[PDB]
Design a protein around this ligand. Sequence first.
Ligand SMILES: CN(C)c1ccc(C(=C2C=CC(=[N+](C)C)C=C2)c2ccc(N(C)C)cc2)cc1
Ligand SMILES: CN(C)c1ccc(C(=C2C=CC(=[N+](C)C)C=C2)c2ccc(N(C)C)cc2)cc1
Lengths: 189, 188
Amino acid sequence: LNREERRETIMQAAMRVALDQGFTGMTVRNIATAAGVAAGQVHHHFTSSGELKSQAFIRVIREMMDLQRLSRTAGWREQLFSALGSEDGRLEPYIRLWRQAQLLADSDPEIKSAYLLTMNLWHDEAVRIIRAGHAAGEFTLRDSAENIAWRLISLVCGLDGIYVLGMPEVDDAAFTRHLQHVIQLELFS
Amino acid sequence: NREERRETIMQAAMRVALDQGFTGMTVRNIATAAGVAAGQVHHHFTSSGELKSQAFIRVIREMMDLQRLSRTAGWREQLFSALGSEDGRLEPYIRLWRQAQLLADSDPEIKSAYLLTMNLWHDEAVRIIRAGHAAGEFTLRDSAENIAWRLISLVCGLDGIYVLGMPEVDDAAFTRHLQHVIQLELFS
Ligand SMILES: CN(C)c1ccc(C(=C2C=CC(=[N+](C)C)C=C2)c2ccc(N(C)C)cc2)cc1
Ligand SMILES: CN(C)c1ccc(C(=C2C=CC(=[N+](C)C)C=C2)c2ccc(N(C)C)cc2)cc1
């Protein structure tokens, strides 16, 4: 192996330890084991364990953003929803790590810089679908796509913050009703 | 006497909580604030957690009363004042409220207290909607409960983006995005 394909065989191993056990299990030794490489060789790439868990967390999200890009001929409403509040069981670890990363960003500026970058990735993706739907002629925009993109994200994050507490009146079904509701007020007035 | 001093202790915990936060709510700094011995704190409080959790609820409870307007202002200005008021004097309440949901992942009592404040916050938003719906100023296309949660989620949400230092989400923009969802939720 030359130099850079190594970096990937390492990075991808970390991306599963994140999905499997979360940040608290993304120790240099766990990535070294999952990859089948010497533990000392891991320090050779992505110094500062903090980096191989923030730099890895991004790749997990980027993978999440791509595992949701679905049939383009589907209604721009169907696309936007799945890109904001998908209920696929396969994404539970992706969300779990995202929820997890949001807290750690308090006591880990390294994460914070990364969590900030995903919010921009999550935002730049919604803006695309908002603009695209607007250009196609299905979305009616009463405000800039950017403003709409931030407000919907805030709805998801905000509701997730309540859904995790255990509110019965805010569960899967209700988390969907609210979201689909707001989409109508923002794009189908 | 019996409770007249229990309140001073609570008033001493509610005070340092806004000044120092949960990290600085030690028994030695709380007993100093009330001006009493430290031992008398455990006498009135079994666990140190029951003091941290209850005091936090008591801070927010009065916080919501402080920001209660005259009831004659427009129901929109009232609902707004209880959602996203941009006031410097709230920062200590907010900072404590942000910390409250963070520690909730590891402190079951702070989790219990935070869950209760969100319901109080929600119960108070329902009130303004129903009163503004009765006065005929609001137009409801959904129950006050659902609208309230969506409005609260919008605040908690942008707030999670605001603190990160996003330039396009500033003090002014936060106000704008909040005024917008009110317009759509209640004025169609
Ligand atoms: C495909 N895609 C782009 C997605 C997919 C899912 C989400 C989030 C989510 C969706 C539905 C949920 N339920 C039905 C229970 C719970 C959480 C979510 C993720 C992170 C988050 N935070 C970090 C606070 C809050 C919510 C976001 C983007
Ligand atoms: C009077 N009243 C009932 C209030 C008053 C203020 C708030 C919150 C708030 C308002 C405006 C902000 N800016 C203009 C920057 C930032 C935060 C707030 C508080 C806690 C919170 N979380 C715990 C997530 C999120 C937002 C909520 C209720």
